[model samples]
Target chain A: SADLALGKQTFEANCAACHAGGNNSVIPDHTLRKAAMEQFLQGGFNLEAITYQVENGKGAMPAWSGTLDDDEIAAVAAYVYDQASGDKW
Target chain B: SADLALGKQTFEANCAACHAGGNNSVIPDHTLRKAAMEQFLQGGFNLEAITYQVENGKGAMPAWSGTLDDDEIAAVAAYVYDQASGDKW
Candidate 1:
């Protein structure tokens, strides 16, 4: 719970700039919206995968490995998952 | 007016993710809000400067020169300037 909140804070600070409202400006289809996350998860979307995506990045998404620590990355992953699952904002 | 609308479209498509509500998530001081634009314009905030910045980018902003056409770039600059001048979307 606390970690999820922290993840939200971190996301707002960094990822929100580009992924606000779970919408991806650069690539609309790649949005963090619930449907998209579900589709991504169909292939296997676990914490590890989320962490890898955050740390490694893809396309327009910047890598956070250099910017955030492991715990911070995990927190963000949790936050994203929770929000993408159903939570709005 | 037609160009202004086009500019708005371009801005929403690209810049809104980070500059929505004139807020700057990465650099708050560099917000696109009226007041901040006015302050930044103290030096000079012309079409050319805006175009250059869009085409080249700075800090966390990405370069649009390759992604957008010259006309699109001009349109976005126009929209940003107008909104920053108090058009408010």
Candidate 2:
């Protein structure tokens, strides 16, 4: 209960801008392509992806590597995992 | 290191089966959408979002409210956040 609240708070603080209610990107078509992301997840989306995309950013996205750390990455990933899994973060 | 170790241990034990590094869902559990997930945290991934999904159990993912407590959830959420955001948790 308390922890869940905490997790929610963290998400709101860091990842709610573009992904709060089904992606806030300009394009609404297939915003969350699991297959596309899956391809990146398997090595394709290694630290390079995290570092580059997160740090340098791509389009409207902002770089996070500078602001975040390895441990923080793990935390957000866990939240995403739990969310995509079935709400078990 | 100790706290990280503990967080890692918890993730490996409860979430590793499906989300250790990237995302390994046989059928895709609750599914927050990878790209959408990234966007979700664009505002900086808050904590309340984490709490909602975790306590309720969206799809295939189980409700962790019973299995894990608030502090435990906070710890794991911290780990996941670190993972998804590039670094820092």
Candidate 3:
């Protein structure tokens, strides 16, 4: 089970700068939100794709694996996934 | 430089099953053609993205790495890229 609390903090600290409210500040139609995740992500809307992107990075996004530990990465991924799935974004 | 001859032969034998003329039979708007590539393929209209998809596969497509050698994979990917780039499909 993912701790939404930890996910929120991790998201706020690291991801919020550009992906706040699930919007992608840099790339159009590449938001962390559900619609774009379905449209743009290779694996479609899911935790796995987001986790891979968060760790490996792509395009303008830098890889978080170098800066964040596995646990933090895990928490943040689930957090974004929850938010996107629930349509909270 | 990619050997277009080898690429053409390799593509006809394998990829032409589902992707003949760059059109994807299973997925909508997921053609190997340039426009759909720009719309759907991550990393966008280029040899690298086509090569990765050719090797690793995606969605309904099976990974060619199991049966096709590197040279064949290399040939086929370039073939699609060439056709899409040239608007010959």
* Candidate 3 lDDT by residue in tens digits, A24-69: 8888578888888998987889888888999998888899998766
Q: Compared with the true structure, what per-residue lDDT tens digits does model 1 show for residues B5-88?
A: 446546666777888887887887888766675576333566677788889887678999887777668877887887777657
DockQ, model 2, C-alpha based? 0.03
Pairs of colliding residues, candidate 3: none
Model 3 ranges with Cα > 4 A deviation: B1-89
Candidate 3: DockQ? 0.01
In candidate 2, what are the lDDT values of residues A6-88, reduced to their tens digit?
33434455666566743445544423234334454333433333334544556666767665555555555545544544533
For candidate 2, give the lDDT of residue B15: 72
Model 2 lDDT, residue B79, Cα: 64
In Å, residue A1's CA in model 1 sits off its true spot by: 7.7
How much is the lDDT of residue B80 in candidate 1? 83
Candidate 3, CAPRI quality class derived from DockQ: incorrect
Relative to the unseen true structure, what is the Cα RMSD of model 3? Answer: 18.1
Give the fraction of true interface contacts kept by model 2: 0.00
**lDDT (Cα, 0-100) at A88 in candidate 3:** 88
The better-scoring model by lDDT among 2 and 3 is 3
Number of the predicted model whose lDDT against the real structure is largest: 3
**CA displacement after TM-score superposition, residue A4 of candidate 2 (Å):** 21
Best by DockQ: 2
